Amino acid sequence: VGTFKAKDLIVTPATILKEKPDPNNLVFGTVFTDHMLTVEWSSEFGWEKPHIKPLQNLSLHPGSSALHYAVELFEGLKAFRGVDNKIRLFQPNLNMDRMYRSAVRATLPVFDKEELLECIQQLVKLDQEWVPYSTSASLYIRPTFIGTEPSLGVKKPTKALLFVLLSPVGPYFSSGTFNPVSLWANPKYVRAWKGGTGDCKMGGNYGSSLFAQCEAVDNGCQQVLWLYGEDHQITEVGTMNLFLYWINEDGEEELATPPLDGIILPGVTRRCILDLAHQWGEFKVSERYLTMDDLTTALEGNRVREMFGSGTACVVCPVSDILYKGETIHIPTMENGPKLASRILSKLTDIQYGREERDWTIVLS
Amino acid sequence: VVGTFKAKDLIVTPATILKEKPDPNNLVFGTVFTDHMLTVEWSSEFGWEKPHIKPLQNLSLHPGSSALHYAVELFEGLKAFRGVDNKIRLFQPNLNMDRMYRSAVRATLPVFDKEELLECIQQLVKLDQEWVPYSTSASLYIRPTFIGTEPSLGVKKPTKALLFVLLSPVGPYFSSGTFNPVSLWANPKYVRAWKGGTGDCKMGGNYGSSLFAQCEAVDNGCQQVLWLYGEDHQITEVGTMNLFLYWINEDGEEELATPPLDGIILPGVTRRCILDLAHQWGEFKVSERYLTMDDLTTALEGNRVREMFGSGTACVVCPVSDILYKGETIHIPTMENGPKLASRILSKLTDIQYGREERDWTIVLS
Ligand SMILES: CCCc1cc(=O)n2nc(NCc3c(F)cc(Cl)cc3F)c(C#N)c2[nH]1
Ligand SMILES: CCCc1cc(=O)n2nc(NCc3c(F)cc(Cl)cc3F)c(C#N)c2[nH]1
Ligand SMILES: *Cc1c(COP(=O)(O)O)cnc(C)c1O
């Protein structure tokens, strides 16, 4: 039981460097930088020294448990080139906390969160010219942790690989504006269950999503609204946390989001939005159950203001419609500004690009 | 695009150095691999490439491959058996091809021609046929595997995939080669699968989530997990195996019971074979029915339980001796009852697998 250390980094620079992309023509998660971080683990010898080396294919035994039994987890965070040309990470300690917690739940080996964050800092530093020269683009950082056990028994792995990829990305939507989405709400598909891994960023949570999203697209919708339970609770939207801004049953202005009862991924963006809403103290902030009946009752009383997803790749993604029980239900998000969604995006973007000082950002090592 | 690969297009790159075969008595499940593997690449742009049989070697995967990030992956498990007549047989391999195809559609992995995949698997086993053990208690495990190799990090249907097949010689699941009854850990805190989920498919995402509960079982002195579901603590599966209960039921009737295929149970090939045999014998009631922990503890207090066992490909029939539940150890008298039915099932399935009797369930290697 132990950790790799950043002071042990072995750095092998690429001798052929790739052209950087146009920061205005960027598709999320498609372009990769020159270098990656890799760290090997075995039960026999523990953590090997960490390597920063050229981006390359992984060489994996075909029996590797990541390939058979989804022994795998990941993270997602961003580096931003500030208005002052200082590169900043955003809330990276929250990602290290979540990745450590996911590793325990996956039965992958633990590591020192500060050692991994310093290894990520050194990788971004080497590839810093990849952090785009744009106030609407960023560098996506993908820490990934896989079982590489070369045996077909279903068991805790005795071999693993932790690696980090970098990808320059633009706005999630090419327009760089709000592209409000239609949601497909079919209770036939359930993303997560009590006693499952839905509250960890484990790869096994995401395999089911593709089929339901393909069905959404066949029915003229862009994303899945994940429903849970006999009362059709609204939980998450695609790969994003779900917020509802409304007048509640008590006549109170409220920002509501489902609570962390085991079927909700505790998003870093979700945490930030709840912290902002509590700080502003302008309306009620509630982690509470929201059902489709709660929503349709509110819509018929003109009580709904905004619905939006939260997540790293999109930040704030408004919802305009839900298809449920054969009816298209309009959500008036875009007819209400969307004032709160816009205020949140502006605040987070100002912090990310260093337009205001914050404890939420760390300058590049 | 090429809609499916064909076996007639197989490219064979033989290994030039062959490995020493293992002792068929000293085999740990899924640890030893044969000389060759099958690989077939797919892209949305061009469809399926030609299939390759080549030496076992590492895969070269883009680190963004969706199998590694979002568990875009599934597998199968089936066996080849060297008969008492030295003919190698497969056991209902078309059921595995059907299950794998159905899982691929649910995963959004590309379709393939099930007959062409089975012919490629036959050619791979034929090349590595000396790996099929010279033992009536050992077999060759076949692991078809299908992974998303999409390099991009969006959560989306893959535009690149790899279908591959590994072979692994395996002995009895336990080195003793006799029944090693297990103790089960029953904790309703963890759930394997749920209604609206993918528990009825061999998708890798069903297994990664299970390891934590298995580790908790082991540190509480148990070998396997009894998977509970719902407010009434339905008993569903035992480890990675289907669950059978042989008992006198609530109505006083001798009964072999197993949970029903309601979407949270893997539809095991061994499970369906056991139900088919039990219906054919007609010596007791055969029921696909819900079973709860209360049903089981009530039966045990009434001395109504005869045998409990798992069914699956790697073990065939795996008896259960004990369950740890609500802080108490509950003895299951499987081994004090022979176990007569478990032994009879094992003997019948092994007689079919090793060609001691003719069966529509076996196919001789082409
Ligand atoms: C898994 C981590 C990487 C990642 C991959 C991926 O494919 N997506 N897609 C995202 N947004 C699509 C989307 C939308 F555009 C709108 C709504 Cl309401 C809901 C929604 F999910 C986001 C985000 N944020 C994201 N992140
Ligand atoms: C996933 C497919 C490959 C595979 C991997 C693996 O680790 N196992 N372990 C198995 N048997 C352990 C076990 C037991 F020994 C006894 C009982 Cl009651 C329940 C049980 F699961 C079996 C079987 N059959 C199996 N198959
Ligand atoms: C990552 C993730 C979230 C939250 O994303 P953040 O980028 O941490 O805000 C929500 N739901 C799912 C399924 C996720 O994978």
Ligand SMILES: *Cc1c(COP(=O)(O)O)cnc(C)c1O
């Ligand atoms: C593979 C598997 C079984 C057994 O299926 P067979 O086709 O008999 O090998 C049972 N339960 C689970 C969860 C499985 O993965």
Ligand SMILES: [Mg+2]
């Ligand atoms: Mg054909």
